[PDB]
Amino acid sequence: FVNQHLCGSHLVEALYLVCGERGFFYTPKT
């Protein structure tokens, strides 16, 4: 699922799945 273009909710979803119990930060304007 990760080696593709991932935008918007799709990217958030990938972060969620990969990062698991760590959580993550989503800072699109960087």
Structure tokens at 30: 């960087």
What x-and-dash track marks residues 7-26 binding other proteins by CB under 8 A? xx--x--xx--xx--xxxxx
Give the separation between CA 20 and CA 1, rounded to whole angstroms: 15
Interface of this chain with a second copy, residues 1 to 30, rule: CB under 8 A: 8-9, 12-13, 15-16, 21-29
Phi-psi region of 6 (alpha: psi -120 to 50; beta: other; left: phi over 0): beta
Interface of this chain with Na ion, residues 1 to 30, rule: CB under 5 A: 25
| Sites of contact with a second copy (CB under 8 A) | 8-9, 12-13, 15-16, 21-29
